[PDB]
RNA sequence: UUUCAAUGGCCCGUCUUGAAACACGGACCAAGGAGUCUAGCAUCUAUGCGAGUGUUUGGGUGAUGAAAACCCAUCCGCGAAGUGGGAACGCCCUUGUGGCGUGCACCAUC
RNA sequence: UUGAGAAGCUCAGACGAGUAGGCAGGCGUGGAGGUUUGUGACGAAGCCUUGGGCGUGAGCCUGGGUCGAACAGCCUCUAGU
């Protein structure tokens, strides 16, 4: 079998139309969730900083965001990752704190019974 | 007696482990040189511009 | 590909071959004959010469390079390893962007093979050089 | 000027792009051949198409 | 190496204006019919449907 | 006196700008070399665009006659900048525009001698030529400037005596008229230049003191 | 063009074989009918840039077809890691002749 | 003296079998980009012809007849040539 790439420009267009389709549904919030900053796990790459999967629970507790609130305002949680050093904790705590500064959370209507 | 295969894979990996930083430093040093190797303005070039 | 005309389709290289065809037969210089022969040569037979080789060859032994133009039918690349560039005057088919900037900012000038033909039509006071073909 | 840049200054819209340089500065080969600098040192031209 | 410095700008009614623009350096670039037709040959193949 | 107007695409604008520049050159102020270098970029292209032979004969006459108009203090800078822009742009001209620029250089060659004669009425001739010989030596006849074309100097040698005789039809006084050529032939690093300039030059040692 | 006269003229291809002999294939005509595409490698040439080089996995963008063209974030691949002869040049000066120097590439000598 | 498609023009001498194989330049076909401000119902293409011409040749141009709606030269690209 020989795989051909004639749909390469048609996949590019289809993926872009999905981003536009996604943005139409969720109008003002970002098309991606904020990702942490981590360091790759080798002696070849540990100097580089890249994006992680989600923020650790210890990073969210320091930033002031609970693990149940976090998912609702676009902050992924990684229950697996941990902070073995204070630099990873502070690098990503500041990342969450900056995110909260630039964030507008629209209020939600709440059911409110008469008494009690 | 000579070496063991436990470190042989570690030595070759440590050899290519510096490939990333060597490429990063080579790219970084090149841009510094290009910043220094800028031909002057030749003020007779904005005469009509 | 090397005998009576270049294999190159570059129009401007044909204009240089045309200019040195006139200079080779209307002058009794072996420089014009040597330059014309090297214009027919292929890219493999015209190796680049570094800016460091030009600086080394001119200021070699007794040095006293004076102001003789260095002529190479080829590309003058750059040697970033050398830090101080002397005042050189080189005429070449091509200079790289870094080599041209280093030669100009560090004193001297860069010429084309037609700018030198007007300065030294017989190639007098020229240092004809070549790149090593070992590669 | 921003799309293409100059032969010495980089293009604004193309990162690290400079206009190509020419193998000849002046491309009028007739001007070089028939110049005072060159015609003053050439030996006396033989005839054109010669008699049989 | 010496070319016209500026170019004139024409109005809607085809009349010249007093404004002028310095000739961009791209018009002084080498003209390479060999290179243009080699690149064109390749680029012209880049919208071909398979058969 | 705008330089952009001097290189306009229509001849009417270029002529108007040339006339306005006539007053600008006669101010009692010192223009720096760069100011004249930019001014001579437009003036070179005003001459570069002249179309018919009759116009470019008069245009070169207008540019040459501009020299006495300039203030005496910065008149030398006007000529020295003319020969700088005629050396860096000479090799870029095409074969159909060289004849129009040969005449301009010839008219300016005689414009130097005529200015020498004018200043000789008040000041002594020896110092006037010394000022001009300094201009020739620092400019076109510089030995450290390898890039100055020989076509300009070959033209200057061909017309040096013939344009000096025009300025002094009756008699030519003793002076260092041929000093720039003597310095060039002796100590130039262009073997083609020094082997051919004595052939082109026709210096008359009849008046100059024997060495 | 047909035909006559004079002179000459063994059936083509394949295989065989010094050569042929051969043995094969051929009733005739039309149409179809066989070194192609692709991946890797090496030489050579051209082109671009050059201690660098390679945009097209992808992203950005593209209103006149938007599967094109145009743009490039992070990677990654591949590269980087003294004496003689001699091209060319100047100076001579008995001027040619030769000599005096400077000596590329490359080859010999340490 | 006009004879610079310098890829042109021009002068001179020698030489000419050829399998395998090596090399160069050309002829023709389908389609593509450009071009000829191209040809065509006052007749395109095709076919026919003891009509004529050009080229060493592959081939090409043309008259007459037949015919009825498309087609070609030049530069480049391409191949189920």
From Swiss-Prot, chain A:
GO terms for cellular component: cytosol; cytosolic large ribosomal subunit; preribosome. One of its GO terms (molecular function) is RNA binding. It comes from the Eukaryota. Keywords: Cytoplasm, Phosphoprotein, Ribonucleoprotein, Ribosomal protein. It is found in: Cytoplasm. The keyword Ribosomal protein applies. One of its GO terms (biological process) is cytoplasmic translation. The keyword Kinase does not apply. Component of the large ribosomal subunit (LSU). Mature yeast ribosomes consist of a small (40S) and a large (60S) subunit. The 40S small subunit contains 1 molecule of ribosomal RNA (18S rRNA) and at least 33 different proteins. The large 60S subunit contains 3 rRNA molecules (25S, 5.8S and 5S rRNA) and at least 46 different proteins. Belongs to the eukaryotic ribosomal protein eL13 family. Component of the ribosome, a large ribonucleoprotein complex responsible for the synthesis of proteins in the cell. The small ribosomal subunit (SSU) binds messenger RNAs (mRNAs) and translates the encoded message by selecting cognate aminoacyl-transfer RNA (tRNA) molecules. The large subunit (LSU) contains the ribosomal catalytic site termed the peptidyl transferase center (PTC), which catalyzes the formation of peptide bonds, thereby polymerizing the amino acids delivered by tRNAs into a polypeptide chain. This is Large ribosomal subunit protein eL13. The gene is rpl13. The chain holds residues 21 to 136 of 208 of the full protein.
From Swiss-Prot, chain C:
One of its GO terms (cellular component) is preribosome. Keywords: Cytoplasm, Phosphoprotein, Ribonucleoprotein, Ribosomal protein. The keyword Ribosomal protein applies. GO terms for biological process: cytoplasmic translation. It is found in: Cytoplasm. The modification Phosphoserine is found at residues 4, 52, 124. One of its GO terms (molecular function) is structural constituent of ribosome. The modification Phosphothreonine is found at residues 75, 77, 122, 126. The keyword Ribonucleoprotein applies. There are 2 genes for eL18 in S.pombe. Component of the large ribosomal subunit (LSU). Mature yeast ribosomes consist of a small (40S) and a large (60S) subunit. The 40S small subunit contains 1 molecule of ribosomal RNA (18S rRNA) and at least 33 different proteins. The large 60S subunit contains 3 rRNA molecules (25S, 5.8S and 5S rRNA) and at least 46 different proteins. eL18 interacts with NAP1. Component of the ribosome, a large ribonucleoprotein complex responsible for the synthesis of proteins in the cell. The small ribosomal subunit (SSU) binds messenger RNAs (mRNAs) and translates the encoded message by selecting cognate aminoacyl-transfer RNA (tRNA) molecules. The large subunit (LSU) contains the ribosomal catalytic site termed the peptidyl transferase center (PTC), which catalyzes the formation of peptide bonds, thereby polymerizing the amino acids delivered by tRNAs into a polypeptide chain. Belongs to the eukaryotic ribosomal protein eL18 family. This is Large ribosomal subunit protein eL18A. The lineage of its organism: Eukaryota, Fungi, Dikarya, Ascomycota, Taphrinomycotina. The chain holds residues 13 to 147 of 187 of the full protein.
Curated annotation (Swiss-Prot), chain D:
The chain holds residues 261 to 312 of 363 of the full protein. It is found in: Cytoplasm. Component of the ribosome, a large ribonucleoprotein complex responsible for the synthesis of proteins in the cell. The small ribosomal subunit (SSU) binds messenger RNAs (mRNAs) and translates the encoded message by selecting cognate aminoacyl-transfer RNA (tRNA) molecules. The large subunit (LSU) contains the ribosomal catalytic site termed the peptidyl transferase center (PTC), which catalyzes the formation of peptide bonds, thereby polymerizing the amino acids delivered by tRNAs into a polypeptide chain. Component of the large ribosomal subunit (LSU). Mature yeast ribosomes consist of a small (40S) and a large (60S) subunit. The 40S small subunit contains 1 molecule of ribosomal RNA (18S rRNA) and at least 33 different proteins. The large 60S subunit contains 3 rRNA molecules (25S, 5.8S and 5S rRNA) and at least 46 different proteins. uL4 is associated with the polypeptide exit tunnel. uL4 interacts with its chaperone ACL4 and the nuclear import receptor KAP104. It comes from the Eukaryota. There are 2 genes for uL4 in S.pombe. Belongs to the universal ribosomal protein uL4 family. This is Large ribosomal subunit protein uL4B.
From Swiss-Prot, chain F:
Keywords: Nucleus, rRNA processing. It is found in: Nucleus, Nucleolus. Pfam families: Nop52 (PF05997). GO terms for biological process: assembly of large subunit precursor of preribosome; rRNA processing. It comes from the Eukaryota. GO terms for cellular component: nucleolus; nucleus; preribosome; preribosome, small subunit precursor. InterPro entries: RRP1 (IPR010301). Required for 27S rRNA processing to 25S and 5.8S. Belongs to the RRP1 family. This is Ribosomal RNA-processing protein 1 homolog. It comes from Schizosaccharomyces pombe (strain 972 / ATCC 24843).
